[PDB]
Amino acid sequence: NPPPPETSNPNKPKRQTNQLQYLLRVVLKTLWKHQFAWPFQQPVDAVKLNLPDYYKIIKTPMDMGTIKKRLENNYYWNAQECIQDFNTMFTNCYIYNKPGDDIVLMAEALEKLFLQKINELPT
């Protein structure tokens, strides 16, 4: 396993915004309870899950546990930075797998719920 993505960085510029607050309270915490969220709540453990090729293929890993920690730690500058992490998470799943896989069906459903939730954000 590589080290997991950072969740703090003292030199990184950070901000507290209504949209980032909403991404934690509403978007992340709603996705988290979905029946399909569980593969995405923690970094992929390639040793535990017996996927020795995972980090051979996925070079920018991302997961909702990391995102949740980043939001709780005030890691982001703006909502777009957070949204990019979700997009990276979903794309990683499509890249490492293929159409029709169970994990991909899960990511597809979550991504559609995610887009529904960020379609309108607070001002």
Ligand SMILES: COc1ccc2c3c1Oc1ccc(O)cc1C=C3N(C)C2=O
């Ligand atoms: C062979 O099972 C797979 C195959 C691919 C993927 C996953 C798989 O299973 C998991 C099992 C437990 C868990 O903690 C996370 C996952 C998340 C996965 N992601 C994100 C994948 O792309």
